[PDB]
């Protein structure tokens, strides 16, 4: 009824108890992922998340409050309970605030903030601390492909040798250009028919994605899903659009060798 994993977030960095200290109040931070105990988090049936025998704890329940390690028996019960929504948030149910990495850098301190469905608020609970590398196969069994920073993504015939068809599925719920991992699949707005492009990863809601159980790739802020515009691969436009279940909105990941 408990199991232990790493927690991967912004830029593929892991949730880490700072300096490996277990003193009550020690802040959580981002740090490159490893096997050290201060990165091993045990998920207990009581909705606590523990490292080094102590609990992930909200040091306050306000926008901007720090998250720390703290003795599980002496902390406030409201401060040590966490849920893991399917879209990859880590939420404190009492406050409704979510774990956020406000900067990408090593040593960034983790805060509880208002949920804006930002990529800075995306996490993955896993023992694999490397991004998953896959092709994204969609409409007509074609492959999603990048075409440079600031340019659109679009469909092409799947090629084992096309590097721009290779995507790094990061723990922060970003979809990155595998060869250029500073770049993220980004919606150019939150409205229906806004185009999906590649932009520098900046932790934004426009860069957060969720692979749901219907084969859709969902942008949580907008609610909208990746769509091959007009079921017309020749337009070379992928947009966000409301979920319809139609073939031009169906996607599956295919792991690469
Ligand atoms: C909760 O904390 C956030 C970080 O302090 C606030 O957002 C930040 O607001 C700053 C100005 O106060 C702004 O320069 C930051 O870039 C922005 N950060 C991001 C990425 O959102 C947030 O403030 C609200 O949202 C911002 C965008 C503005 O609209 C503010 O007027 C809002 O108050 C804080 N939210 C709350 C509940 O106050
Ligand atoms: C969390 O805080 C608890 C209360 O201060 C610690 O339990 C207390 O540990 C004291 C020092 O070991 C001991 O004199 C007390 O009997 C005990 N108090 C209670 C109510 O159990 C607790 O320490 C852990 O649990 C106790 C029972 C022993 O097994 C300790 O050696 C454990 O470390 C603190 N937990 C942690 C992880 O620090
Ligand atoms: C995706 O990109 C990664 C990162 O560049 C590639 O992984 C590197 O591969 C080289 C050659 O095998 C290794 O020596 C490095 O250790 C890898 N780096 C990291 C950080 O993992 C990878 O080959 C690319 N393609 C695929 C299919 O994963
Ligand atoms: C698909 O898009 C291409 C490129 O713009 C266009 O020439 C073609 O007529 C479109 N096909 C349909 C059925 O609209
Ligand atoms: O705080 C920086 C760094 O300190 C040590 O190197 C720890 O082992 C890491 O896990 C990390 O916490
Ligand atoms: O115009 C955009 C819209 O075009 C058609 O209606 C498609 O079926 C939708 O999925 C969407 O692509």
From Swiss-Prot:
Official protein name in the record: Nigrin b B chain
2-alpha repeat ranges, renumbered to this chain: 140-177
Residues modified by glycosylation: 63, 71, 178, 232
Domain Ricin B-type lectin: 1-126, 129-254
Renumbered ranges of 1-beta repeats: 52-92
2-gamma repeat positions: 222-249
Disulphide bond pairs: 14-33, 55-72, 143-158, 184-201
């Amino acid at each position: 009824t408990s199991f232990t994993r790493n927690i991967v977030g912004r830029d593929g960095l892991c949730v880490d108890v700072r300096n490996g200290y277990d003193t009550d109040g020690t802040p959580l931070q981002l740090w490159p992922c490893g096997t050290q105990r201060n990165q091993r988090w045990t998920f207990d049936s009581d909705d606590t998340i523990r490292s080094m025998g102590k609990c992930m704890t909200a040091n306050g329940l306000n926008n901007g409050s720090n998250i720390v390690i703290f003795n599980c028996s002496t902390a406030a019960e409201n401060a040590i309970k966490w849920e893991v929504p399917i879209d990859g948030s880590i939420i404190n149910p009492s406050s409704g605030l979510v774990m956020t990495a406000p900067r990408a850098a090593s040593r960034t301190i983790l805060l509880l903030e208002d949920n804006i469905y930002a990529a800075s608020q995306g996490w993955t609970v896993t023992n694999n601390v490397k991004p998953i590398v896959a092709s994204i196969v969609g409409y007509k069994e074609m492959c999603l492909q990048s075409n440079g920073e600031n340019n659109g993504v679009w469909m092409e015939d799947c090629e084992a040798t096309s590097l721009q068809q290779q995507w790094a599925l990061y723990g922060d719920r970003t979809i990155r250009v595998n060869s250029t991992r500073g770049l993220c699949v980004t919606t150019n707005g939150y409205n229906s028919k806004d185009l999906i492009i590649i932009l520098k990863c900046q932790g934004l809601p426009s860069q957060r994605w969720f692979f749901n159980s219907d084969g859709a790739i969902v942008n949580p802020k907008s609610r909208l899903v990746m769509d091959v515009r007009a079921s017309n691969v020749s337009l070379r436009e992928i947009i966000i659009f409301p979920a319809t279940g139609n073939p031009n909105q169906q996607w599956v990941t295919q792991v690469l060798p």
